[PDB]
Design a protein around this ligand. Structure first.
Ligand SMILES: CC(=O)N[C@@H]1[C@@H](O)[C@H](O[C@@H]2O[C@H](CO)[C@@H](O)[C@H](O)[C@H]2NC(C)=O)[C@@H](CO)O[C@@H]1O
Ligand SMILES: [Cl-]
Ligand SMILES: [Cl-]
Ligand SMILES: [Cl-]
Ligand SMILES: [Cl-]
Ligand SMILES: [Cl-]
Ligand code: NA
Ligand code: NA
Length: 129
């Protein structure tokens, strides 16, 4: 599924990401935009052979099991394919674990490079939330 911006904002808000660990909703929407272009089916292969999955491009090196990232962890205890669902619950719940792990949203490269320190509230501007 390719979410609309506000649709995703609303979904993320309903799933408790607004101000989760102090990260306002726009951070999450911004991260999703630049990680996946709001596409839950996005996958990208990393140089180390892991793959990033889903709307928040959660990687299989650490967070999910895709059966083809040897020596990786599965800290979200999910098949990576669960992160591709049109239902973002699995991504959100895993993202909550990630962002809780001490490094905040810096785990999301795109967030660090494209959202962090920007006016992320713009990403939820106009949305009914
Ligand atoms: C939370 C999450 O999974 N974020 C992804 C990053 O982990 C991806 O970065 C890449 O992650 C792999 C596995 O840890 C690293 O081996 C690789 O060096 C790293 N790539 C970069 C440029 O840092 C990122 C890839 O675009 O996608 C999500 O942000
Ligand atoms: Cl868009
Ligand atoms: Cl915000
Ligand atoms: Cl694996
Ligand atoms: Cl959902
Ligand atoms: Cl933080
Ligand atoms: Na990425
Ligand atoms: Na894994």
């Amino acid at each position: 599924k390719v979410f609309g911006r506000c649709e995703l904002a609303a979904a993320m808000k309903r799933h408790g990401l607004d101000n989760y660990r102090g990260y306002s909703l726009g951070n999450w929407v911004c991260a999703a935009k630049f990680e996946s272009n709001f596409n839950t089916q996005a996958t990208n292969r990393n140089t180390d052979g892991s793959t990033d999955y889903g709307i928040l491009q959660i990687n299989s090196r650490w967070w999910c099991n895709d059966g083809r990232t040897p020596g990786s962890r599965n800290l979200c205890n999910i098949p990576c394919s669960a992160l591709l669902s049109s239902d973002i619950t699995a991504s959100v719940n895993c993202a909550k674990k990630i962002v809780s792990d001490g490094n905040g949203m810096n785990a999301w490269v795109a967030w660090r490079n494209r959202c962090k320190g920007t006016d992320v509230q713009a990403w939820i501007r106009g949305c009914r939330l």
